Design a protein around this ligand. Structure first.
Ligand code: GTP
Ligand code: GDP
Ligand code: GDP
Ligand code: MG
Lengths: 426, 161, 428, 48, 31, 35, 22, 426
């Protein structure tokens, strides 16, 4: 009855979910056929968090692969660790979104929302009750954002008291494919700010910067970026599936981080991260891990925390470490970065310890922290929107499918209200 | 029981001692590798610990039996020359008996047997009379108190009685 | 005949008692399968032939640690029905641990309480082991005490609360949990023992001189200080002190029952080779600010009443000499409304130790138990902690969404303020 | 290849080619409670 | 290209920085 | 499609798994509890 | 209501491992 | 314990610091892979002063290798004792200073000093309590003087109370490569006089003099010259890491020599230094070691000791010796040489004993001297600076990147203030 139902939203959500399920199947010792291995009892000890029985002793993932074009769902099926999913979990789209918000949300949404909810109900009341859902999606494309957040928009009133954990890949500042980037970005945020319980931002150019200057790889494929983010939510949900002397849940993170119900946009760290010559020469200990973790270049949301104030933060540890080196190196960071935190909360950040680490890791931290430094992108999306909305261009692709003026103006009205909301908490 | 055979213990000056020789002395096993960088950083501190506390002593208080993790006869004797106390020859059956007995091996695990943990190099296991682990000195453990855990030796209550 | 029921709520409570019941079965010599290879009856009941069942109940809303004890080493001595698994965690909320999800566990837990107390007459007390900062430790921790004061209203509910450190709190909504559970814990408990995390962290650094403690190393010391409190219960001594007596000589007014502890010696094997563990110095070594369990400096405080109970082969003659040594000291300034301030408990049992833990052995263990007016500062830092977070109603939408209406935040302010001023008006 | 800072763990999966040979399964437990409280053989027993 | 960063080139440390000489002249390495 | 070994392991992110491992002697677990 | 193996501890498992060892 | 953070600045600093790390590695018995040999307690008990445990039994030097051209540190890694350093600790430049103070300090050094500070506080914060920062550089080279002294100045305001000891190598009059010699020397001293606690001065012509006249060495090379400086570079730190009957620390030498804060420039020397045919014929004892100690040709700085007065001096011995033959040999050199010592201070000599000799040597000593006769290098640097300044020669390479004309004038005003301050203490 502790389950998290995964939802794969759009093409970006399919690859980031396929890599995530791979790094947790072999974490839990699972054959791509579906049998159990792994030489440690902990791996099946909590196996129903993400899986279910297949009435033959086989383990099947509890995820809903969803996209509007069958090519990418054939690619994850033909790939390794793709035969785990039962064939009925996949839902097919035929027409495919033309990278348009109005196309994914209104026109062909209603002919697939009837199916993709029927498949996520049968996973939900497969047990008596659960704690909530997790989804993975992007704000750049059409099918990755349109019914990716409309799926949220129906399950919000379906299961009201359940955590709604969403991984959003935001459009990059410096680089931009799919030229209508802010049109999918702002029109998804203006309902995700009240229909999603807890959201994490994943920035593309942040990920390339991590893999170039602190991970030192030269030509990062999207699969390489997929593994760096797959280790992020392998840690944030690790204590739901594994013991520790400081237990934590996703609701535990939600209450300790979200002060006010409007503001739930979170930055993510994963440490340690070194290159081939630096793995052997760098110590592995808590005081150096936390101090490397509180860096801007580790952060996979590259809005500079030096230009903002950490309202609150959180660190979940993974490995055979104690608790007080988590504690007094928390307060050592607290008094050293006295102005980098917020003054009316002393001891800003919560912490956790989980016993098992990832495979071949000594101590690892996932860093879910709420900071107001993130305005450098939300005013960037807002003024990139008003550059194109004022000139009216690239909007007649949207008018004939249900978009109109007063929902557009409501989008920046909810946008700059949230931008000015964080400024006054400063 | 008789933990060691008649011709197993092996000290400096190249002579054998029997098992009754360890009567009334604090007995400890030194699972260590010759080329291991942990052992390079730790062996000088065991040399001083063995130095001062029994030289400034009324009776013989400490014996350490090196039990080796090495790979060669020539590498065994090269580490042997830098070390005075008791030991066990590598290619007797004894090394791989106390290896599985005290859970001290070196990630060679699945190609030999399907158990779990290893608690490998380095380690000192001070032991009792009946081959029991007496207490753990935490060099590389959850405490990971390397180079200092020798002060946690409880020498009065651990005797080979 | 003689029995005490131990209750554990929260993850701190379950692992503290995971070290307490380990140290209890180590005392009586019973193998931890329940088999022994009449004095144990206050902690264990006899079920059949040679089988010992603990008088403990394990409570939480989150099943990842009750099932860890169940599958752990103590699977058979701990009979599988004393442990209770919950549905979902209270998630750092008093409102969740008390109002919404606590109703499905409090009914089963109380059905256990009166069917564990009806077995034999002569019930003596309860050892409530709770964490004030935790959501289920204060939520289900609170919810059990008013229901225990309704049915067993004429009995003793002794408590062990782990107060947070000023700097180490490991949670953000932690001061919200502490303020809003202490008022409801106030008139439903009768003895409160406040410990601290960073205080025992300082102890482990200083006199037991580990650079590297963890929660289980915290749990060795707290299991020792509870065991010394219950030393005269289980076994025999000269001046035996029982559960009905810890409040007899510490609580002068029904409001003032919050109280500190310490322990001496807290040493290693190399730390016992070289010094007196004499009676004339252990009391001195248990009174400094670098020795208590709450990091609360009593030099600007004023000592009020204290039990000083011993265990081991110890004679009350040099105990009496050590008492006059303290009274003649000027730095430990006792109150003027009682010239007498001491009890000297005494028991013959040698101080047990855990083989493996760093706490070495001694033939004298001393727990200092002390009520003092120094609590005014440790609750005042707790008060201004809440006032800074309550400036613009932070983290309150979680609590009011659970059903706990806005407005009973606010009398918790002036109820703890009324408790804070109680320390000044008793010390004048 | 220990001494040259061994960087891969796939050598431990060479022997279990079916991974169902009854040798490695159910052989370890890595919780802090067994780090502090677990001794020689009273951990895995049948219930009579 | 696919490999890790080449950080440092091949570097023949010639006699300009191949010290010795004063090495044994200061370390007293006997005649 | 250029189905060579280094192309396939790059897009599958096997190199990031190699560097994210810790290259020294790994699994330490001793039971300090004595009978 | 999903039913798992006895080594997965959901619902009653102490009184499920002992009658049917699975 | 207490930590020394080495920084190697410029091409000169990288090479002389590499020989420093070699002469201290064999001093501690460290295998060039990073491991240990020698089986002695006394060596590794204090190795944290210059090394860090890297969770694998290897000791990583606390050295920040940097300059603006990658061609320098590319050679020290391929050389011996080069792989001990951490690769991410190495911070690179790409354009390189064009042999000038100004492109170092202002233009191409501002964007690199951000990453330089980050790795300095990476090493400094990671320990409990730190002793001081130690920096080897040159006061004649472009990157060794330009942003090398900017690194000296900028670390002062965050860490003003730890000791600040630097080794600086000055241009030579008789051999003048690096054609802008006095522009780099004069205009760096005026900033290094107020942001550095203790500066030791080295002249290459003096290091050449010890090769010919004392060692009878035929062909001296640049790597040989770096071992001459590395001998007393380790001799000034012997008792920092090893025990002694009379201790010496870096703050011990700083407080006990300079009487006034603006005066902090020293000479240095190393004894014994024998020749090819004079090992087994020269006695090694304290009475002869003090005679080679106060030898004008023995000095590694080309400022003449006998042209003026010794303000203070220090002699830190190394090895096993009787310490009152250390003491009375300080007494009698003041007795026969009264004019060579300053008169308003009795007992100019400070002495201390480190009990660990250098390897193969029974007995050695190092000079930390303080003479008022350092003027012959000050006026000689100053008058070539004014030689090229009054005809405005080679100023177009300096003033073309945002420099006023008054920085040279106040550099000269600080320069002759140092001349006038030292000359009135004759
Ligand atoms: N003294 C002591 N305190 C502990 C220990 N473990 C946790 N705590 C305290 O417990 C507080 C939070 O409660 P937790 O134990 O983490 O969790 P809980 O009691 O189950 O309540 P929840 O947070 O809702 O899960 C922290 O502030 C810790 O100070 C322990 O082993 N010893
Ligand atoms: N999946 C994936 N996404 C990328 C890649 N490169 C960039 N992106 C991001 O993915 C977004 C593309 O939108 P997408 O969801 O794939 O289009 P959709 O499938 O029609 O919804 C852009 O905003 C990019 O920031 C890549 O190689 N793979
Ligand atoms: N001690 C020492 N001096 C050097 C070395 N190389 C060059 N020098 C001297 O320093 C000057 C070179 O300036 P330098 O600081 O290397 O220029 P940079 O490349 O900007 O750092 C020359 O005039 C040499 O006389 C060396 O390896 N050691
Ligand atoms: Mg629990």
């Amino acid at each position: 009855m502790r389950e998290i139902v995964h939802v794969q939203g759009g093409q970006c959500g399919n690859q980031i979910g396929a890599k995530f399920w791979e790094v947790i199947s072999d974490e839990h010792g699972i054959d791509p056929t579906g049998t159990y291995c792994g030489d440690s009892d902990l791996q099946l000890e909590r196996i129903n968090v993400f899986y279910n029985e297949a009435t033959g002793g086989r383990f099947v993932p509890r995820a809903i692969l969803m996209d509007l074009e069958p090519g990418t769902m054939d690619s994850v099926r033909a790939g390794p660790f793709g035969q785990l999913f039962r064939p009925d979990n996949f839902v097919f789209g035929q027409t495919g979104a033309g990278n348009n918000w109005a196309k994914g949300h209104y026109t062909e949404g209603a002919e697939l929302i009837d199916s993709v909810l029927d498949v996520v109900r049968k996973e939900a009341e497969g047990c008596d009750c659960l704690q909530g859902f997790q989804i993975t999606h992007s704000l750049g494309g059409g099918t990755g954002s349109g019914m990716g957040t409309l799926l949220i928009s129906k399950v919000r009133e379906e299961y009201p008291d359940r955590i709604m954990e969403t991984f959003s890949v935001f459009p990059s500042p410096k680089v931009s494919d799919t030229v209508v980037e802010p049109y999918n970005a702002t029109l998804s945020v203006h309902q995700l700010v009240e229909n999603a319980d807890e959201v994490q931002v994943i920035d593309n150019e942040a990920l390339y910067d991590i893999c170039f200057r602190t991970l030192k790889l030269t030509t990062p494929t999207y699969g390489d970026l997929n593994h760096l983010v797959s280790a992020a939510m392998s840690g944030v949900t690790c204590c739901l599936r594994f013991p520790g002397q400081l237990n934590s849940d996703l609701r535990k993170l939600a209450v300790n981080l979200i002060p006010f119900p409007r503001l739930h946009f979170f930055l993510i760290g994963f440490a340690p991260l070194t290159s081939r010559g630096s793995q052997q020469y760098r110590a592995l200990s808590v005081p150096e891990l936390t101090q490397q973790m509180f860096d801007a270049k580790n952060m996979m949301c590259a809005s500079d925390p030096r230009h903002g104030r950490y309202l609150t933060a959180s660190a979940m540890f993974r490995g055979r470490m104690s608790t007080k080196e988590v504690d007094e190196q928390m307060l050592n960071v607290q008094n050293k970065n006295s102005s980098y935190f917020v003054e009316w909360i002393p001891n800003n950040m919560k912490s956790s310890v989980c016993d098992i680490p990832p495979k071949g890791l000594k101590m690892s931290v996932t860093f879910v922290g709420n900071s107001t430094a993130i305005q450098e992108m939300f005013k960037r999306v807002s003024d990139q929107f008003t550059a194109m909305f004022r000139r009216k261009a690239f909007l007649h692709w949207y008018t004939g499918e249900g978009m109109d003026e007063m929902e557009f103006t409501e989008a920046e009205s909810n946008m700059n209200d949230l931008v000015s909301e964080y400024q006054q908490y400063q | 029981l008789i933990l060691f055979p008649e011709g197993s213990l092996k000290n400096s000056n190249n002579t054998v001692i029997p098992q009754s020789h360890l009567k009334g002395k604090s007995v400890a096993l030194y699972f260590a590798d010759g080329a291991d960088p942990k052992c390079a950083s730790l062996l000088p501190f065991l040399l001083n610990y063995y130095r001062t506390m029994n030289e400034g002593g009324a009776n013989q208080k400490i014996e350490i039996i090196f039990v080796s993790l090495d790979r060669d006869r020539e590498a065994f004797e090269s580490h042997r020359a830098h070390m005075p106390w008791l030991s066990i020859d590598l290619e007797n059956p004894l090394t791989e008996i106390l290896k599985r007995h005290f859970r001290v091996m070196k990630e060679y695990e699945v190609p030999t047997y399907g158990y779990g943990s290893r608690t490998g190099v380095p380690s000192v296991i001070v032991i009792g009379s009946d081959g029991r682990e007496a207490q753990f000195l935490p060099i590389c453990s959850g405490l990971e108190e390397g180079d200092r855990a020798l002060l946690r030796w409880d020498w009065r209550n651990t005797k080979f009685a | 005949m003689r029995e005490v029921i131990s209750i554990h709520v929260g993850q701190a409570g379950i692992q503290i008692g995971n070290a307490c019941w380990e140290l209890f079965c180590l005392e009586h010599g019973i193998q931890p399968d329940g088999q022994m290879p009449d004095a144990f009856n206050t902690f264990f009941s006899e079920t059949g032939a040679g089988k010992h069942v603990p008088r403990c109940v394990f409570l939480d809303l989150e099943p990842t640690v009750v099932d860890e004890v169940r599958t752990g080493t103590y699977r058979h001595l701990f009979h599988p029905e004393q442990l209770i698994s919950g549905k979902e965690d209270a998630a750092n909320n008093f409102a969740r641990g008390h109002y919404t999800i606590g109703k499905e566990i409090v009914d089963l837990s109380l059905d256990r309480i009166r069917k564990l107390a009806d077995n034999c007459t002569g019930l003596q007390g309860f050892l409530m082991f709770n964490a004030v900062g935790g959501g289920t430790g204060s939520g289900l921790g609170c919810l059990l005490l008013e229901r225990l004061s309704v049915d067993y209203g004429k009995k003793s509910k002794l408590n062990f609360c782990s107060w947070p450190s000023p700097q180490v709190s490991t949670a953000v909504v932690e001061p919200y949990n502490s303020v809003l559970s202490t008022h409801s814990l106030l008139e439903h408990t009768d003895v409160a023992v406040m410990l601290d995390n960073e205080a025992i962290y300082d102890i482990c650094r200083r006199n037991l001189d580990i650079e590297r403690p963890t929660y289980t190393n915290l749990n060795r010391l707290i299991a020792q200080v509870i065991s010394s409190l219950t030393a005269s219960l289980r076994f025999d001594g000269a001046l035996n002190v029982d559960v009905t007596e810890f409040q007899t000589n510490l609580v002068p007014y029904p409001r003032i029952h919050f109280m500190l502890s310490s322990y001496a010696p807290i040493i290693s094997a190399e730390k016992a080779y070289h010094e007196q563990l004499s009676v004339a110095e252990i009391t001195n070594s248990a009174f400094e600010p670098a020795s208590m369990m709450a990091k609360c400096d009593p030099r600007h405080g004023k000592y009020m009443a204290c039990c000083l109970m011993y265990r081991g082969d110890v004679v009350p003659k040099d105990v009496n000499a050590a008492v006059a040594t303290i009274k003649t000291k000027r730095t430990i300034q006792f109150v003027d409304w009682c010239p007498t301030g001491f009890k000297c408990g005494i028991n013959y049992q040698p101080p047990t130790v855990v083989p493996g833990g760093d706490l070495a052995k001694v033939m004298r263990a001393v727990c200092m138990i002390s009520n003092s007016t120094a609590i005014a500062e440790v609750f005042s830092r707790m008060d201004h902690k809440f006032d800074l977070m309550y400036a613009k109603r932070a983290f309150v939408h979680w609590y009011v969404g659970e059903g706990m209406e806005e407005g009973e935040f606010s009398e918790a302010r002036e109820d703890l303020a009324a408790l804070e001023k109680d320390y000044e008006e008793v010390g004048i | 290849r220990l001494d040259a800072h061994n960087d891969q763990k796939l050598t431990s999966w060479r022997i279990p080619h079916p991974l169902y040979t009854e040798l490695p399964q159910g052989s370890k437990y890595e919780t802090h409670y067994r780090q502090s409280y677990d001794y020689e053989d009273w951990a895995r027993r049948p219930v009579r | 290209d696919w490999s890790e960063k080449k950080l440092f080139r091949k570097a023949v440390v010639s006699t300009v920085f191949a010290s010795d000489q004063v090495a044994e002249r200061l370390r007293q390495d006997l005649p | 499609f250029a189905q060579d070994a280094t192309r396939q392991r790059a897009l599958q992110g096997h190199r990031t798994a190699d560097l994210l491992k810790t290259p020294f002697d790994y699994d330490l677990f001793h039971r300090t509890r004595l009978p | 209501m999903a039913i798992h193996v006895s080594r997965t501890h959901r619902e009653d498992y102490i009184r499920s491992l002992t009658p049917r060892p699975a």
